[PDB]
Amino acid sequence: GPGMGASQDDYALIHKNILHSEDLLKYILETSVYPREHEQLKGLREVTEKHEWSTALVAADEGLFLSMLLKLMNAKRTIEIGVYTGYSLLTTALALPEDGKITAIDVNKSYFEIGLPFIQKAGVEHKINFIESEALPVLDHMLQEMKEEDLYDFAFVDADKPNYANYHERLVKLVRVGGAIVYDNTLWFGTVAFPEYPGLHPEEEECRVSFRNLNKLLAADPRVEISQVSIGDGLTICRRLY
Amino acid sequence: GPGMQDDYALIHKNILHSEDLLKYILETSVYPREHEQLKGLREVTEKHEWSTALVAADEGLFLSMLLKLMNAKRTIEIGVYTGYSLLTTALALPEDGKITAIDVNKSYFEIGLPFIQKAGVEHKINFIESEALPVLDHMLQEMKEEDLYDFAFVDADKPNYANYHERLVKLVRVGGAIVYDNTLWFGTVAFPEYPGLHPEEEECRVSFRNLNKLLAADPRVEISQVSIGDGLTICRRLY
Numbered sequence: 001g002p003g004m005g006a007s008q009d010d011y012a013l014i015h016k017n018i019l020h021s022e023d024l025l026k027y028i029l030e031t032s033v034y035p036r037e038h039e040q041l042k043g044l045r046e047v048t049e050k051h052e053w054s055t056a057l058v059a060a061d062e063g064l065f066l067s068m069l070l071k072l073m074n075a076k077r078t079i080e081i082g083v084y085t086g087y088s089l090l091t092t093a094l095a096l097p098e099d100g101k102i103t104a105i106d107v108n109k110s111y112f113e114i115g116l117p118f119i120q121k122a123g124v125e126h127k128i129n130f131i132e133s134e135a136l137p138v139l140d141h142m143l144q145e146m147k148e149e150d151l152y153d154f155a156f157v158d159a160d161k162p163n164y165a166n167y168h169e170r171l172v173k174l175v176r177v178g179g180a181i182v183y184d185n186t187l188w189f190g191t192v193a194f195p196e197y198p199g200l201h202p203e204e205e206e207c208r209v210s211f212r213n214l215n216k217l218l219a220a221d222p223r224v225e226i227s228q229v230s231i232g233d234g235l236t237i238c239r240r241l242y
Numbered sequence: 243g244p245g246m247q248d249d250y251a252l253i254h255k256n257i258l259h260s261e262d263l264l265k266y267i268l269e270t271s272v273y274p275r276e277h278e279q280l281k282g283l284r285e286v287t288e289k290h291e292w293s294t295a296l297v298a299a300d301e302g303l304f305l306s307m308l309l310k311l312m313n314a315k316r317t318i319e320i321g322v323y324t325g326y327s328l329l330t331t332a333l334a335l336p337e338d339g340k341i342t343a344i345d346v347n348k349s350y351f352e353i354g355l356p357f358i359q360k361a362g363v364e365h366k367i368n369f370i371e372s373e374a375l376p377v378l379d380h381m382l383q384e385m386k387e388e389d390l391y392d393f394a395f396v397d398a399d400k401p402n403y404a405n406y407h408e409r410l411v412k413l414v415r416v417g418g419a420i421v422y423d424n425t426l427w428f429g430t431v432a433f434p435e436y437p438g439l440h441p442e443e444e445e446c447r448v449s450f451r452n453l454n455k456l457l458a459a460d461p462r463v464e465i466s467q468v469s470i471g472d473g474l475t476i477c478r479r480l481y
């Protein structure tokens with residue numbers, strides 16, 4: 001639509017961190033992440049860091065953390081909403097068993113095509129079913145065809161942040177009891193801690209407001225237990241109770 | 243010598259950008275989800291002379307999530323203090339869950355014991371008053387494959403963590419988790435030198451810098467260091 005430019009260079013928050021120490025974040029990455037990062041993850045991250053939407057790239061320490069959750073819960077079937085160039089998707093596919101399966105949904109397959117050669121070299125493209133679409137129609141179509149036996153173990157939600165509350169209403173039915181839904185970016189550069197925050201792009205401000213509403217909603221939702229984790233840009237792990 | 247936590251440079255646990263962000267996480271996402279007996283235990287512990295030791299409450303809720311997601315049933319805790327992470331664990335486990343809890347100081351555990359009892363989960367806990375290293379070595383001579391733990395939380399004397407790790411990678415099952423608290427040690431690990439630390443705090447800075455490298459290099463586990471609370475490192479045993 002007509003209006004203000006909404007490129008990454010038009011945003012205010014790009015360089016802001018949720019850790020107070022830039023040195024600490026680099027310590028974590030150099031000590032505990034890069035030595036443990038798959039060579040194809042490294043290549044995909046390095047190409048994505050140059051891309052015009054590099055701000056959206058999941059953080060590499062968050063990557064290893066998502067991998068750990070998947071392995072510890074023995075996830076086998078997962079859904080990812082918001083693929084971009086494929087870092088969390090490649091992380092997920094490397095974590096799952098050889099016969100694991102991922103439903104991966106993104107409006108923009110051209111982004112996916114950037115990471116695809118890395119995912120192919122890693123030997124795990126066969127686990128991925130990529131759907132080029134807005135996520136909400138796909139999720140609604142799943143609700144009508146999904147069997148109890150095929151509920152997902154794990155969902156990673158990282159797409160268009162104002163829609164998370166809408167995705168949640170479907171995902172609490174598409175993930176198994178005991179399964180996990182992980183919402184990325186729920187601390188939104190730390191701006192969620194303030195009732196108003198000057199200087200934001202209108203899309204940044206909409207996400208600040210969206211996440212303040214989502215974080216209250218998830219804390220109050222009896223269908224899940226939650227843990228909000230100050231890693232990357234914040235994430236909230238939800239475990240379906242019924 | 244003879245005489246009488248204020249001697250220490252590291253008293254506030256917040257690696258986040260602002261005190262406001264951490265408070266927001268706690269009020270929005272932790273306190274509404276915190277069991278009444280955890281709230282009571284935390285509030286009495288905040289008045290204890292070693293309250294800085296108390297596990298961060300957002301970290302507690304995350305431990306609880308991890309335990310449930312991995313369906314843990316048998317756990318070991320090294321370093322109990324007043325029992326916040328222990329009560330968190332006992333509330334997270336199924337009714338038949340079992341915890342081996344080890345601390346040198348039972349008087350601290352007795353501060354938390356009434357809340358654990360009121361919470362109805364004392365039956366899950368075998369508390370052992372001892373330095374942990376002898377206990378783990380004794381367990382290694384005796385335990386069989388059926389007695390392996392699903393999960394270990396390590397939150398005791400920081401310079402001994404690498405020593406604990408060598409026992410725990412044998413006492414935790416393949417695929418189980420070993421979780422180390424405080425591996426970012428108030429942010430000090432990010433620096434090769436750090437001014438003004440108490441001799442014990444500096445010793446922990448050095449030991450954590452050594453431990454973090456060791457765990458990153460250890461082929462027996464995979465890891466994830468997580469910038470929550472004072473940092474924790476989750477290890478999953480590979481073989």
Ligand SMILES: Nc1ncnc2c1ncn2[C@@H]1O[C@H](CSCC[C@H](N)C(=O)O)[C@@H](O)[C@H]1O
Nearest residue numbers: 056057058082084088106107134135159160
């Ligand atoms: N309505 C919608 N439905 C599905 N995908 C959407 C969407 N709106 C935006 N997206 C996609 O969501 C993605 C968010 S960035 C995703 C980052 C990725 N998980 C990583 O690990 O780096 C973008 O690729 C964008 O194209």
Ligand SMILES: Nc1ncnc2c1ncn2[C@@H]1O[C@H](CSCC[C@H](N)C(=O)O)[C@@H](O)[C@H]1O
Nearest residue numbers: 295296297321323327345346373374398399
């Ligand atoms: N060698 C050792 N063996 C077992 N416990 C030890 C120890 N050295 C120190 N400790 C104990 O380790 C604890 C660290 S504080 C533990 C915090 C607790 N897990 C919480 O949730 O708040 C103290 O209670 C201390 O008494």
Ligand SMILES: O=Cc1ccc(O)c(O)c1
Nearest residue numbers: 294295296297397424472
């Ligand atoms: O010894 C002091 C201490 C300080 C912080 C901690 O988290 C801890 O476990 C111990």
Ligand SMILES: [Mg+2]
Nearest residue numbers: 058158184185
């Ligand atoms: Mg994200």
Ligand SMILES: [Mg+2]
Nearest residue numbers: 295397423424
């Ligand atoms: Mg601790």
